[PDB]
Curated annotation (Swiss-Prot):
Substrate binds at residues 207, 519, 581. The gene is nanB. Its EC number is 3.2.1.18. Keywords: Glycosidase, Hydrolase, Repeat, Signal. GO terms for molecular function: exo-alpha-sialidase activity. It is an enzyme of class 3 (hydrolase). One of its GO terms (cellular component) is intracellular membrane-bounded organelle. BNR repeats lie at residues 242-253, 424-435, 479-490, 528-539. It comes from Streptococcus pneumoniae serotype 4 (strain ATCC BAA-334 / TIGR4). This is Sialidase B. It catalyses: Hydrolysis of alpha-(2->3)-, alpha-(2->6)-, alpha-(2->8)- glycosidic linkages of terminal sialic acid residues in oligosaccharides, glycoproteins, glycolipids, colominic acid and synthetic substrates. The keyword Transmembrane helix does not apply. Coiled coil: none annotated. The active site is at 232 (proton acceptor), 503, 615 (nucleophile). It holds the Pfam family BNR.
């Protein structure tokens, strides 16, 4: 179909543009599509890009609009007072503002489909909403429409929602164009997607990105594939990975690094309304918060993540139990059998389930997948699926049998309901992953697992030492392995915070000198230093010059391989805002060789101060560019839950930052 209207290079400077003569008599039929390429790097708080309205006195509620907010939210209003219809559809965090010093051309496609009674919005090739209604209102059939407007809506002769921005191209069609046709519209995106809705994971949500450049030049990414909306555990969440062999230009179809199968892998549109948005999958085991490192000795890639048994998360995990029993200097996973009111069993060498009351072994064994065997035969459980067909969340058996796992709700033998850390390895740089193993407890029998710091582990340059940061109440607990992750020890470092979410990432400033940057509850990023390869740790200092909220946000950090201004450089990635998870920046610091102090000299704004930026991953690509994979939304805001395709990847050069 040809457009009935096409126009371009409109400048919106707080003054609307009338296109009524050009457009209104071209409108026909009850289905329409609007395609609009626009820039808005200095938006007003609330502004309309396009309006169709009845401008006459007494008809102020008869209009259609496409609007945005300076938070990056996009939406439409479709209103007719005589028909008794007032629709408002929107989604937060749907826009880009600037990239590399230049306003981004956003490509918006809005489809108004009378036959399917559905309104669908795409921005930058991402479907941000699709809503079906019982009573359809064609945007062309609003009673008394007499104005078509760019950069405002004319209501009763006055300009409402005045815009600052530009519309480089706008087209309208008297047809609801198909999803196929939409996908052929050229985009001008500053970002790409690695993980996305409808991919191999079948998770509709993604959180907690990581990146790591392997010695072969392959760039590996891990992520939480989150199924029950964006909620932290308790939920259903798997850990997925993808890699790039061309410096981040293209990425492999994702595979799982860690997965559970007690619940179906379902792509679900999680409700965003206030009544149901806290709906949470409550019977599923999950993984959460992954971290990756490469081992020089074995050549293996190592991935760690937290593990949550069925229905467990931070909120309800037993704080005073590691889930292990010490039996002469060795720790064994405890198990509770169906019917018991105590944990009367342990898992021993070769997976033999032992009875503790009698110190007898049983006829049960645990395989390498943590699955229950009886007499060597696989036991099974029935899988669950979730649905909202009743109008609220239901989790119901689905007729499919899967192997019985000790982390499952329905298992004959069940682990302690607390958090664990697991490890898996890959011998083919992310093409496949081994079955995970649990790490032992590090803080004793009666302390829950520490929490893994997401992102990267650290492989020291001059040895085979591997370090993963974790945190718990009152300290960072570094996990150290010198034998390819076969065995681990802890190195504890006190921090002046009780129950902080002290997410920490490390850089090696020089040989054996590690600086750890971490989240706090003070509004400043903190740091500490080791000069003995992680054995001992300095007191805590704070960075002034970067602001975080009271609750804080993960910070990612790398040591750049090249000198900047003749100095060694560290790059940090974090929101810079005392108010919310927004105003993303890369901050380049130069190391003072005399004392290892860091002068934070350059700040690069990843997008507008008001646009969302939360957890992030950064890596130096093999070509010395910087790859950034990040949550482009406010992941703390209870208004921005359950958004799809907000974890996004960009490529930057040092020259862009400085």
């Amino acid at each position: 179909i040809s457009p009935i209207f096409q126009g371009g290079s409109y400048q919106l400077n707080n003054k609307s543009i009338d296109i009524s003569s050009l457009l209104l008599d071209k409108l026909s039929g009850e289905s329409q599509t609007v395609v609009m390429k626009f820039k808005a790097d200095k938006p007003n708080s609330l502004q309309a890009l396009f309006g169709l309205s009845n401008s006459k006195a007494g008809f102020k509620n008869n209009y259609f609009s496409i609007f945005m907010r300076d938070s990056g939210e996009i939406g439409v209003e479709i209103r007719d007072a005589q028909k008794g219809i007032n629709y408002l559809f929107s989604r937060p965090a749907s826009l880009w503002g600037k990239h590399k010093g230049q306003a981004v051309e956003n490509t918006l496609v809005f489809v108004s489909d009378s036959k399917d009674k559905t309104y669908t919005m795409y921005v930058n090739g991402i479907e941000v909403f699709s809503e079906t209604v019982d009573t359809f209102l064609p945007i062309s059939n609003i009673n008394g429409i007499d104005k078509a407007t760019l950069g405002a809506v004319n209501r009763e002769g006055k300009e409402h929602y005045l815009a600052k921005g530009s519309i480089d191209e706008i087209s309208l069609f008297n047809k609801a164009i198909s999803d196929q046709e939409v996908s052929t519209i050229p985009l001008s995106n500053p970002f790409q997607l690695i993980f996305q809705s409808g991919d191999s994971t079948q998770a509709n949500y993604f959180r907690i990105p990581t990146l790591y450049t392997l010695s072969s030049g392959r760039v590996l990414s891990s992520i939480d594939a989150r199924y029950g909306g964006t909620h932290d555990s308790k939920s259903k969440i798997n850990i997925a990975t993808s890699y790039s062999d061309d410096n981040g230009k293209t990425w492999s179809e994702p595979i799982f690094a860690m997965k559970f199968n007690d619940y179906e892998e379902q792509l679900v549109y999680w409700p965003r309304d206030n009544k149901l948005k806290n709906s949470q999958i409550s019977g599923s085991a999950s993984f959460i918060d992954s971290s990756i490192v490469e081992d020089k000795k074995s050549g293996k890639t190592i991935l760690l993540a937290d593990v949550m048994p069925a229905g467990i998360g931070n909120n309800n995990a037993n704080k005073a139990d590691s889930g292990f029993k010490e039996i002469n200097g060795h720790y064994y996973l405890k198990l509770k059998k169906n019917g018991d009111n105590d944990f009367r069993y342990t898992v021993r060498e070769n997976g033999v389930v032992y009875n503790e009351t009698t110190n007898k072994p049983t006829n049960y064994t645990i395989n390498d997948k943590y699955e229950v065997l009886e007499g060597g035969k696989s036991l099974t459980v029935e899988q669950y699926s979730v649905d909202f067909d009743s109008g609220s969340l239901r989790e119901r058996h689905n007729g499919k049998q899967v192997p019985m796992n000790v982390f499952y709700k329905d298992s004959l033998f069940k682990v302690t309901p607390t958090n664990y850390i697991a490890m898996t390895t890959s011998q083919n740089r992310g093409e496949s992953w081994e079955q995970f193993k649990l790490l032992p407890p590090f803080l004793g029998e009666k302390h829950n697992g520490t929490y893994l710091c997401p992102g990267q582990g650290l492989a020291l340059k001059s040895s085979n030492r591997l370090i993963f940061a974790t945190y718990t109440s009152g300290e960072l607990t570094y996990l150290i392995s010198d034998d390819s992750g076969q065995t681990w020890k802890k190195s504890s470092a006190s921090i002046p915070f009780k129950n902080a979410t002290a997410e920490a990432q490390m850089v090696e400033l020089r040989d054996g000198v590690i600086r750890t940057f971490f989240r706090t509850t003070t509004g400043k990023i903190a740091y500490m230093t080791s000069r003995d390869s992680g054995e001992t740790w300095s007191k805590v200092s704070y960075i002034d010059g970067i602001q975080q909220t009271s609750y804080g946000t993960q910070v990612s950090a790398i040591k750049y391989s090249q000198l900047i201004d003749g100095k060694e450089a560290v790059i940090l990635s974090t929101p810079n805002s005392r108010s919310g998870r927004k105003g993303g920046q890369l901050v380049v610091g130069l190391v003072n060789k005399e004392d290892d102090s860091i002068d934070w000299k350059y700040h690069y704004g990843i997008d507008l101060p008001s646009y969302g930026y939360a957890y992030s991953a950064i890596t130096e690509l093999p070509n010395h560019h910087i790859g950034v994979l990040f949550e482009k939304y406010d992941s703390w805001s209870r208004n921005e839950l359950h958004l799809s395709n907000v974890v996004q990847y960009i490529d930057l050069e040092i020259n862009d930052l400085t």
